[PDB]
Write a protein that holds these residues in place. Structure first.
Motif, PDB file in Angstrom:
ATOM      1  N   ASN A  54      27.881  38.668  49.898  1.00  0.00           N
ATOM      2  CA  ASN A  54      29.186  38.340  49.259  1.00  0.00           C
ATOM      3  C   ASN A  54      30.214  39.358  49.635  1.00  0.00           C
ATOM      4  N   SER A  55      30.599  39.353  50.895  1.00  0.00           N
ATOM      5  CA  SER A  55      31.481  40.409  51.426  1.00  0.00           C
ATOM      6  C   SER A  55      32.074  39.964  52.760  1.00  0.00           C
TER       7      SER A  55
ATOM      8  N   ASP B 256      32.495  45.090  42.651  1.00  0.00           N
ATOM      9  CA  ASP B 256      31.769  43.894  42.232  1.00  0.00           C
ATOM     10  C   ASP B 256      30.247  44.039  42.414  1.00  0.00           C
TER      11      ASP B 256
ATOM     12  N   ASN C  16      28.179  43.134  44.523  1.00  0.00           N
ATOM     13  CA  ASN C  16      27.481  41.932  44.991  1.00  0.00           C
ATOM     14  C   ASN C  16      27.502  41.796  46.497  1.00  0.00           C
ATOM     15  N   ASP C  17      27.929  42.860  47.189  1.00  0.00           N
ATOM     16  CA  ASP C  17      28.219  42.707  48.608  1.00  0.00           C
ATOM     17  C   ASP C  17      26.960  42.341  49.433  1.00  0.00           C
TER      18      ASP C  17
ATOM     19  N   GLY D  15      31.403  36.262  45.978  1.00  0.00           N
ATOM     20  CA  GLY D  15      32.607  36.512  46.747  1.00  0.00           C
ATOM     21  C   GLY D  15      32.847  37.941  47.156  1.00  0.00           C
TER      22      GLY D  15
HETATM   23 CA   LIG Z   1      31.870  41.230  47.136  1.00  0.00          CA
END
Ligand SMILES: [Ca+2]
Ligand SMILES: C[C@@H]1O[C@H](CNS(=O)(=O)c2cccs2)[C@@H](O)[C@H](O)[C@@H]1O
Ligand SMILES: C[C@@H]1O[C@H](CNS(=O)(=O)c2cccs2)[C@@H](O)[C@H](O)[C@@H]1O
Ligand SMILES: C[C@@H]1O[C@H](CNS(=O)(=O)c2cccs2)[C@@H](O)[C@H](O)[C@@H]1O
Ligand SMILES: C[C@@H]1O[C@H](CNS(=O)(=O)c2cccs2)[C@@H](O)[C@H](O)[C@@H]1O
Ligand SMILES: [Ca+2]
Ligand SMILES: [Ca+2]
Ligand SMILES: [Ca+2]
Ligand SMILES: [Ca+2]
Ligand SMILES: [Ca+2]
Ligand SMILES: [Ca+2]
Ligand SMILES: [Ca+2]
Lengths: 114, 114, 114, 114
Positions: B21-22, B101, B103-104, A114
């Motif tokens: 994830n962004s 996070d 995870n981008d 996310g």
């Molecule tokens: Ca993210």
């Protein structure tokens, strides 16, 4: 040792992706809290993605990967790595034969999403 | 420290896969021996695969991942993990904003293949 | 990204061991829940152990490693790895100069104990 | 899978350190290119260091860890992690009994030195 079992934080979305590098057709079973929640079946000798899904770790956080080829369980290797105390990878290799490349099905679990 | 740079064995096939994830469009540049050989561009908040390719590490074995969003470099985190002295993962996370996070864009390099 | 920070399970015994590989005298500060609980000071260019202690992660579980030489903060690199979903290693390298070996003080954190 | 086997660069100095967490007396055997070069014997239930040495990886770079208790081979788990494409840790856990803590002897191999 048991391999391919990971404890995730509870109720967390995670990604699971599998790649194949074998003459054998790979079946990857993904269990969350002891229930099968995804199955990926495919064949490639060139790292083709044989599945990618988003799942939830549920109350118990227990994620297990199993791999079989022609109904025979492959031998697994695994670890979890955490970067910046926050970004998680749960990693699985598997061996369906005796060359010991451990890449016959490769599974990557990542969170958070996310 | 510099992150996102890995030494692979020379002249070796490897897989590179990128996930997003962004809210931001991610650009992932893959360089082999200091030349761009692949660029993945995409956008997802649900871990979509924005690229997956098989590449060769060439003479020098140098693989570098760079990630940016609208021309601005993301902050990278990375490591390499080796299972059974044979199965290799080179792992990259990136942060495009402030929530940390990492995870981008997430990048997984794996070898060997086949 | 921030490096050298790890979240452990609460009230858990852990080991911390530091090695030195530098001309400079290394000062390793170990903080648990934002308070210094151990300081290792030593010097070696051949991997001498400059400290090894058993500590407790306390109520919050936060463990942070900081390294300085001559009062100047060293640049840190870190990651955590988990084997067999049970055995934990938190790993830190530090660089006090320009050669980027990241081994000037090396810190290994392990748990569980006993 | 075989565990506890690592490929180091040829003719490279490395550190090996063993910790004990078991009621059983641990015997750690370090082999370089299939010959024993160090043996560490000790007991602790509080993470005492039972050995620490600097060794050379020799022409073939092969380093293997074996662990036994009273002549019975322990089950091993292992992985290698590389930080900043430079700092290497080869990690071994071992289990001598039934609790599956894999910490009974813990071995860390680090390089480069200096
Ligand atoms: Ca993210
Ligand atoms: C290309 C190689 O494929 C084998 C698996 N081949 S197989 O025909 O499925 C089997 C033979 C005996 C048991 S399964 C992989 O293990 C190799 O690593 C290669 O990828
Ligand atoms: C959904 C969140 O998206 C941001 C990035 N948001 S953005 O609007 O693309 C940017 C704004 C300033 C710089 S980029 C991620 O960083 C969050 O982790 C979330 O995925
Ligand atoms: C032996 C080398 O030592 C340096 C640090 N040398 S020092 O005298 O402490 C400094 C000089 C300027 C800033 S610190 C390490 O960084 C090298 O890796 C070598 O181990
Ligand atoms: C304190 C615990 O010690 C055992 C090993 N017990 S033992 O007496 O050495 C053995 C008995 C049969 C085989 S070895 C460890 O396995 C536990 O993890 C604890 O550290
Ligand atoms: Ca195989
Ligand atoms: Ca294969
Ligand atoms: Ca972000
Ligand atoms: Ca240095
Ligand atoms: Ca140094
Ligand atoms: Ca045990
Ligand atoms: Ca034990």
């Amino acid at each position: 040792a048991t391999q391919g079992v990971f404890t995730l934080p509870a109720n967390t979305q995670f990604g699971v992706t599998a790649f194949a590098n074998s003459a054998g057709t790979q079946t990857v079973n993904v269990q969350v809290n002891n229930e099968t929640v995804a199955t990926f079946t495919g064949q490639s000798t060139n790292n083709a993605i044989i599945g990618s899904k988003v799942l939830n770790s549920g109350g118990g956080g227990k994620v297990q990967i199993l791999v079989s080829v022609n109904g025979r369980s492959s031998d697994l290797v695994s670890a979890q790595v955490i970067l910046a105390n926050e970004l998680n990878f749960a990693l699985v290799g598997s061996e369906d034969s005796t060359d010991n490349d451990y890449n016959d099905a490769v599974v990557v679990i990542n969170w958070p999403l996310g």
